[PDB]
Amino acid sequence: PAKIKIVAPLESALIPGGETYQLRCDIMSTPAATIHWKFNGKLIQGSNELNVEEKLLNFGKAIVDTGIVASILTIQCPSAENSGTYSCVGYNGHQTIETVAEVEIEGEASGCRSNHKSAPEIVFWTDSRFEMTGNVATLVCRANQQVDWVWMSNDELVKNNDKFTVLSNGDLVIKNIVWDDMGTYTCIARNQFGEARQETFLYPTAHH
């Protein structure tokens, strides 16, 4: 049965102006959930898109699809114009969950250069994914910039074949998973401004 649950909520906070500030939410969900962010009800990061392609690949199988996803929102130069209502919204196709926080900036941003030409940041990722042996699983990463994606397993590069597929949006598709696929997969986002890294985790569950 579909379930969605907050692991780490946003919390209301009074924050110093001009100092970079990062919000984070973690969400446990079956099936896999997507996270987007809102400021005073207006969308500012992420999407409603679900991974319907993987559902097709697993169509007619017994699906586990349980795990935790995480997302960060970075506030570069907090000013009075950034004080307001921030919400992290998780969504799995069946249920919607939302964590809301009042963030008020206390002070002025006399000197603060928000570098648009800063390193890319991985702002959403599959923290953990549980799936049954024999099914397709997907590890998700999303970035705040245009990047090229590279995935690493156990310090070896992941290359496209009939099992692994590195997609251009940031997904790593693993077909016909087996217990030896268990472990950490690092997603690397590279562009002209820098590279970001983020670990994901895959657990193939026993098939009874």
């Binding site: 935790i68 549980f130 268990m182 472990g183 985790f201 657990y203 026993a206």
Partner: protein, 52 residues
């Protein structure tokens, strides 16, 4: 410990606590995590072993 065997337990214990909440003694789930990172566990066991 190999890093792979150590991140596994961390992610498993997070899912288990998220499922059970207070119904799961932390040292009780920590034993589930050790078992299921050495040997392959089923989904049902992972999601219910600490709180049937």
């Amino acid at each position: 410990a190999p890093g792979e065997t150590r991140a596994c337990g961390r992610k498993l214990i997070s899912l288990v606590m998220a499922v059970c909440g207070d119904l799961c003694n932390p040292q009780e789930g920590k034993d589930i995590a050790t078992e299921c990172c050495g040997n392959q566990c089923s989904d049902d066991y992972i999601r219910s072993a600490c709180c049937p």
